[PDB]
C-alpha cells in the first residue's frame with residue numbers, strides 16, 4: 001500500500017471549484033504545478049468522512065487500485081495526498097460526463113464518433129478483462145470525455161444500477177466478466193440513444209420479468225442494424241453465450257470501418 005512515488009506535496013495543488021461527485025464526496029477542479037507541466041488542470045477527489053480511519057482506508061483503496069492500470073481510455077491517477085484532508089489527484093476530462101455530452105450534441109456528432117466511443121471503451125474493457133479485474137463498485141461506473149475523439153472509463157461524476165445489470169447479478173448477485181459484458185451492451189445502447197437511460201418509467205422490480213419474457217431494449221433511431229445486433233448478443237440470458245470483450249472490440253472495429261465506408 002505504498003504511495004511514496006506518487007505522493008504529491010500539497011502546495012503544488014491549487015484546489016478550485018466543485019465539478020462533480022464520487023462515492024466518497026465532492027470532486028473539484030484543480031491545478032497541479034510540477035516540473036513536467038507548470039500548470040496542469042486536474043480533478044481532485046475529496047472525502048467527506050475520512051476522519052474515520054475505516055472510511056479513509058476504503059477511499060485510498062480507490063487510488064491503490066487505479067495505480068495498477070495504465071490505458072489510453074481509463075482515467076489516469078496522477079497522485080495522492082494521504083495526510084488530512086486526503087485527496088486523490090486524477091487527470092481532468094475537460095468535456096465532462098459522456099451522458100450530458102451526448103445529450104447536448106445529438107446533431108453535431110456523426111455516427112462514426114458514437115461508434116468510435118464504443119470501440120475505445122471496449123479496448124479499455126478488454127485490457128481489464130486480460131488483467132482478470134472485476135470492478136466491484138458497479139454504482140460508481142461512469143464514462144468521461146477528455147476530447148472530441150477520446151472517452152475514458154472512470155468511477156466518479158462530473159443504490160444498485162438494476163436497469164443496467166445482468167439477470168444473474170439481479171437474481172443471485174453473481175458478478176463476472178460476462179455480467180460486465182451485459183452492462184457494456186447497455187452502455188452501447190445508451191451511447192446510440194444519445195444518453196437516454198434504459199427502462200425509463202419502469203420500476204426496478206419489473207426489470208427481471210421483462211428480461212425473462214424475452215424483452216430487450218429496442219433498436220435506437222438511426223442505429224446501424226449490425227451494431228444493434230452486437231448489443232443483443234451482449235444480452236444473451238445465459239452468461240456463457242455472451243461475447244468476450246476481445247470479440248466485442250474486434251466487431252466494433254469492423255462496424256466503425258464500415259460506417260466510414262458509407
Ligand SMILES: CCc1ccc(-c2ccc3c(c2)-c2n[nH]cc2S(=O)(=O)N3C)cc1
Pocket residue numbers: 065066069074125135141142143153154155180181183184185187
Ligand atoms: C480505475 C478502476 C476502474 C473504475 C471504473 C471502471 C469502469 C467504468 C465504466 C464502466 C465499467 C468499468 C465496466 N466494466 N464492465 C462494464 C462496464 S460499463 O458499466 O459499461 N462502464 C462504462 C473500471 C475500472
